[PDB]
Design a protein around this motif. Structure first.
Motif, PDB file in Angstrom:
ATOM      1  N   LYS B  46      39.703  49.104  34.179  1.00  0.00           N
ATOM      2  CA  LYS B  46      40.812  48.246  33.776  1.00  0.00           C
ATOM      3  C   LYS B  46      42.045  48.458  34.651  1.00  0.00           C
ATOM      4  O   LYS B  46      42.762  47.492  34.943  1.00  0.00           O
ATOM      5  N   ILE B  49      41.290  46.466  37.830  1.00  0.00           N
ATOM      6  CA  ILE B  49      41.507  45.038  37.591  1.00  0.00           C
ATOM      7  C   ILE B  49      42.997  44.714  37.557  1.00  0.00           C
ATOM      8  O   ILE B  49      43.443  43.708  38.130  1.00  0.00           O
ATOM      9  N   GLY B  53      44.938  42.261  40.227  1.00  0.00           N
ATOM     10  CA  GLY B  53      45.667  41.092  39.755  1.00  0.00           C
ATOM     11  C   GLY B  53      47.151  41.144  40.073  1.00  0.00           C
ATOM     12  O   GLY B  53      47.765  40.113  40.383  1.00  0.00           O
ATOM     13  N   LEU B 118      47.533  44.967  30.520  1.00  0.00           N
ATOM     14  CA  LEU B 118      46.771  43.791  30.941  1.00  0.00           C
ATOM     15  C   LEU B 118      47.229  42.533  30.210  1.00  0.00           C
ATOM     16  O   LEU B 118      47.347  41.456  30.814  1.00  0.00           O
ATOM     17  N   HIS B 121      50.465  41.397  31.739  1.00  0.00           N
ATOM     18  CA  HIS B 121      50.205  40.635  32.964  1.00  0.00           C
ATOM     19  C   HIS B 121      49.761  39.206  32.652  1.00  0.00           C
ATOM     20  O   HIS B 121      50.198  38.244  33.309  1.00  0.00           O
ATOM     21  N   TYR B 122      48.921  39.050  31.623  1.00  0.00           N
ATOM     22  CA  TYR B 122      48.507  37.721  31.170  1.00  0.00           C
ATOM     23  C   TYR B 122      49.683  36.891  30.655  1.00  0.00           C
ATOM     24  O   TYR B 122      49.808  35.708  30.997  1.00  0.00           O
TER      25      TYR B 122
ATOM     26  N   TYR C 122      38.714  37.263  33.637  1.00  0.00           N
ATOM     27  CA  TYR C 122      40.122  36.939  33.873  1.00  0.00           C
ATOM     28  C   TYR C 122      40.535  37.171  35.327  1.00  0.00           C
ATOM     29  O   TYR C 122      41.210  36.324  35.927  1.00  0.00           O
ATOM     30  N   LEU C 123      40.138  38.307  35.907  1.00  0.00           N
ATOM     31  CA  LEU C 123      40.435  38.583  37.313  1.00  0.00           C
ATOM     32  C   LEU C 123      39.741  37.596  38.244  1.00  0.00           C
ATOM     33  O   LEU C 123      40.299  37.229  39.286  1.00  0.00           O
ATOM     34  N   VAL C 126      41.752  34.421  38.137  1.00  0.00           N
ATOM     35  CA  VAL C 126      43.001  34.682  38.857  1.00  0.00           C
ATOM     36  C   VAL C 126      42.788  34.594  40.365  1.00  0.00           C
ATOM     37  O   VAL C 126      43.540  33.915  41.075  1.00  0.00           O
ATOM     38  N   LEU C 127      41.752  35.266  40.877  1.00  0.00           N
ATOM     39  CA  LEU C 127      41.523  35.268  42.320  1.00  0.00           C
ATOM     40  C   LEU C 127      41.030  33.921  42.832  1.00  0.00           C
ATOM     41  O   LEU C 127      41.268  33.589  43.998  1.00  0.00           O
TER      42      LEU C 127
END
Lengths: 376, 376, 376
Positions: B46, B49, B53, B118, B121-122, C122-123, C126-127
């Protein structure tokens, strides 16, 4: 109201899973200590993040009425309903009934609820906003009176949502439907109705009236445009930015020196039904207040202009009809046609697919760009 | 620097919550065994990730200076600050002080920290990038010298961010501001200043000069354009792709046979201040190297062109002023007007709302399209 | 197939981490009770959310073949591979080998796996979809035959993905490449090849043929257009919407009265190679069925039209070549040029950066808009 009350119930469900063992049956609970409190703090921050995101992306009024049922919002409501009812049933049958004495497990169950609600919010914004980003299809939209056409690019939408995007772009890109620019051809067709291969030969050698009528009409439009520009410049030159007067009275003072030329230009271009005198006075005072040139004033009236410049009772949105062969909840695919019929015209939309593009490379030496002065 | 150091502190906070009981007071900790290690592995994935991101969406230089404080980034910084300080206080008051002997709870507390980071960030990418996607409003942008106007569609932005999007689209859509295309009307207005309803009647029957001057000017522009096309074709035909010479010397070799016609065309269309000789030689060597036709060379010079084709000291961005009545941090709504004043002109922007569209259906039988050949 | 089998393995990995201690060695497991079951329910809802999101954003056929390796999908596949193999190794070395008797930890390990797979999804989005939204660069795309140019705005893409977006927009914005509109200049250049500063003086005083040829050609095009409009109106007026006949036979009935004028107009505008008779009959029956005006029929043929109106074997996408100096996997930056070479032309694309814009404010008193009627 209604949805706010259900959102309040969903927001107060984890807190109600927390608070009931420290209210009902306090005398049996084991001490959580430092294990439970960090979980409470993490729960509070995740509920704050969920509330901010829910306000940011779902506290807004709906924007359209679609013919059939919207599939993805119905799926999200069924998912949230089954989710919340399943957690209430598991809390009532096992935890609250048998009085599960470890409070740590109840707090972890509530934290798992808040986590899964956050992932429900993520899945909601995925299904509603991110699947439509990558352009899979293109759309040709043709208005069936003057032929004006636009291309657009869309992703995986339904026919409802694609029709909504086309209707969004119609008020922005297309010029306004003017029925007076169409009677000159219908009168010509009805004149031809007053009186096949051999008759088509006698037509093309028989003095086309349409070319000379178009040339004379374009000359008249350019002459009226020139006199309008002269009148509007010599009307704007009569006021100074500094009797002191507000811009409405300044518009009323300089308007009778430009009024008749503007009226003649709106009659010669068939725009006299769109612009009342009060609209011209409001736009004139607007351009006077903001400090705009006479051509900046005249640009609203020289061209036809898009649909949404005009008054709200001139463009109409509460009567659109969606003619399609298949079900409108189906997604877009290559080769389908659907029609958006308004009260007097229609937008014929047909969908093509963006093709499979194969890229390769060349390795050109950069010193090969040296060459000579020989006669090519 | 500064923000990288704070990001390093936020990234090393969960690892520091992990590492301190296996460093300070090792002799008291219970063995975690196989419970802790899977949590360590999940924590590591995590964090990986989160780092990928964060690099993907927030490691970039800022793009604009906005007048007032940006609301959403300030909210995100306050949220991260209160979040990290609250976890450090709960770790120092309860866990590190009392020396909480179960290491499993400390590792679960760190995993909850990484999870909530996380979701921070979302929430950050939701507040900064996803709320502005769905088009709620339309914007009319009119430049207040020549009247050129564009419509755009925006979501829920502030007046700052909407003004930034309008300034993004100005350098791409609008042609460059040419002050020499405006003096011909100001000299005419000052000529009218040398000397109301009755005077407007004597004007429209008094030989409009403007129409004949426009027609003669368009004839001169088309003649200079034709001679420019002839000169540029007969200049490009003098070189062969293969004395061997680089494209700069080839541009210098073929330029004196097209130079005077291009100079006359730039003088007749009032573009002589935008194109120096070195710019023309660089673009000529560019079109020579890439292998372009003479019309592909001339398309830069035939039209006016948008603002960002030209030199970086010709278009200017470090002096824009945002005139508005309300606070610029407020969101967009229906019926507001704000002005983007540059050094010599202004963009008047007014916002309308996309209307509530009601769709319905027709059920047309497809066998009703069979019809007759009677005279309509 | 292949990717569906690996997706099935990734989806069945947490369930296989769950099911093996209640199958292999049931006689040793401690009773989980009410702790495990809520974790099972949360796991099931998170797997459902993951399956719906994976179907929503990744169950689609690939759209392009890019020259080098795609970087971000390779990074995602390496990340998923190392992630799943690391969890299988930690399950086999520690949990399954030593037979870890607490089933609660195994269920929590599986829930952590499902959580980290959700953050991998999710990542991934995002990418692949969110980094390219914010416009950092602008692109000028010029076709190297007629010079037609467009500007676009892109974010942080590679040269591959930027070239793919340019090729998406080419079939939508640019008109179709017509090689017959280019031979009139090449024949003129080869005529000049039959026979520097002093010769350029004798050219501009020697009767430009090109202006009079363009004027006469525009007169002929307008005359053929007028006769085409007359023929198509008097051809559409011969049918009534109601011998009963389908729209194909109605198109065949009204086509021989408009055929020769349309053939002459397609020859005079050099479009006779794009429109066969069967294409005209299909479009005619299309406009007859949908109920469109004759100008709505003629709008396909009056202008040149974009590339994707026409037949699928006329536009071609399986031969594009990407000429660039640096590696095409590198991101966009300010001042690079890359060329998309087709079989007969090329799109020269050069990238500029959107500048750093500084906004400020003016505080204009709204009562200062009161002024006078003095002569300006």
């Amino acid at each position: 109201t209604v949805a706010s009350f259900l959102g309040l119930l969903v927001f107060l469900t984890p807190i109600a899973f927390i608070l009931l063992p420290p209210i009902l049956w306090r005398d049996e609970l084991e001490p959580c200590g430092t294990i439970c409190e960090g979980l409470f703090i993490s729960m509070a921050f995740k509920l704050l993040i969920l509330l901010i995101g829910t306000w940011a992306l779902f506290f807004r009024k709906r924007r359209a009425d679609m013919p059939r049922v919207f599939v993805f919002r119905a799926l999200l409501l069924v998912l949230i309903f089954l989710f919340v009812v399943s957690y209430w049933l598991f809390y009532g049958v096992r935890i609250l009934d048998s009085r599960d004495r470890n409070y740590q497990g109840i707090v972890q169950y509530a934290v798992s609820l808040v986590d899964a609600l956050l992932f429900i919010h993520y899945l909601a914004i995925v299904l509603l906003e991110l699947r439509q980003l990558q352009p899979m299809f293109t759309l040709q939209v043709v208005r069936s009176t003057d032929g004006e056409s636009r291309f657009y690019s869309l992703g995986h939408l339904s026919i409802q949502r694609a029709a909504l995007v086309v209707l969004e772009n119609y008020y922005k890109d297309f010029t306004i439907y003017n029925p007076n620019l169409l009677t000159a051809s219908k009168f010509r067709a009805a004149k031809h109705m007053a009186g096949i291969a051999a008759a088509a030969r006698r037509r093309d050698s028989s003095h086309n009236e349409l070319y000379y009528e178009e040339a004379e009409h374009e000359r008249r439009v350019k002459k009226r445009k020139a006199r309008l520009v002269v009148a509007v410049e010599e009307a704007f030159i009569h006021i100074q930015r500094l009797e002191v007067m507000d811009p409405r009275e300044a518009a009323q003072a300089i308007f009778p020196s430009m009024a008749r030329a503007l009226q003649k230009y709106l009659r010669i271009t068939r725009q006299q039904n769109y612009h009342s005198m009060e609209s011209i006075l409001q736009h004139l005072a607007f351009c006077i207040t903001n400090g705009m040139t006479p051509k900046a004033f005249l640009e609203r009236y020289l061209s036809a202009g898009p649909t949404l410049q005009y008054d709200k009772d001139r463009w109409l949105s509460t009567q659109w009809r969606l003619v399609s062969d298949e079900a409108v909840t189906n997604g877009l695919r290559d080769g389908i046609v659907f029609v958006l019929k308004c009260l007097d015209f229609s937008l014929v939309v047909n969908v093509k697919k963006i093709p499979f593009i194969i890229l390769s490379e060349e390795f050109i030496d950069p010193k090969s760009h040296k060459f000579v002065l020989r006669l090519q």
